[PDB]
């Protein structure tokens, strides 16, 4: 699989989430990604497999830690993703109706 990187730098916050847990022998990946959001600008899509955060390998950090790595960002955030197989998908037209899933979240949101 061909790996790649994506750095998102901007004034406003991000609009994506993360999950998994290295400590729990679980890989890190994006939980949710708002349509046309900040992360989307860089070309990120929910489902991808996270390899590193803020230019630092996330193979030593846990789920909760992974978040702090992003929020800690000050100038720019550099994340690394890879080509996943049958990860997941989404819908764009749904936006027209207002198909969202953001509410009572934040603990993991970024």
Curated annotation (Swiss-Prot):
<comment type="function">
    <text>May function as a scaffold on which the coordinated assembly of proteins can occur. May play a role as an adapter that, via its PDZ domain, localizes LIM-binding proteins to actin filaments of both skeletal muscle and nonmuscle tissues. Involved in both of the two fundamental mechanisms of bone formation, direct bone formation (e.g. embryonic flat bones mandible and cranium), and endochondral bone formation (e.g. embryonic long bone development). Plays a role during fracture repair. Involved in BMP6 signaling pathway.</text>
</comment>
<protein>
    <recommendedName>
        <fullName>PDZ and LIM domain protein 7</fullName>
    </recommendedName>
</protein>
<feature type="modified residue" description="Phosphoserine">
    <location>
        <position position="78"/>
    </location>
</feature>
<feature type="domain" description="PDZ">
    <location>
        <begin position="1"/>
        <end position="84"/>
    </location>
</feature>
<comment type="subunit">
    <text>Binds via its LIM zinc-binding 3 domain (LIM 3) to endocytic codes of INSR, but not with those of IGF1R, LDLR, TFRC, or EGFR. Interacts with various PKC isoforms through the LIM zinc-binding domains. Binds to RET in a phosphorylation-independent manner via its LIM zinc-binding domain 2 (LIM 2). Probably part of a complex with SHC and the RET dimer. Interacts with TPM2. Interacts with TBX4 and TBX5.</text>
</comment>
């Amino acid at each position: 699989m061909d790996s790649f990187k994506v750095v998102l730098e901007g004034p406003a916050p991000w609009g994506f989430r993360l999950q998994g847990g290295k400590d729990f022998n679980v890989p890190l990946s994006i939980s949710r990604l708002t349509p046309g959001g900040k992360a989307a600008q860089a070309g990120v899509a929910v489902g991808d497999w996270v390899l590193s955060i803020d230019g630092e390998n996330a193979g030593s950090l846990t789920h909760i830690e992974a978040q702090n790595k992003i929020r800690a960002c000050g100038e720019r955030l550099s994340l690394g993703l890879s080509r996943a197989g049958a990860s997941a998908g989404a819908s764009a037209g749904a936006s027209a109706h207002g198909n969202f899933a953001f509410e009572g979240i934040g603990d993991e949101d970024l």
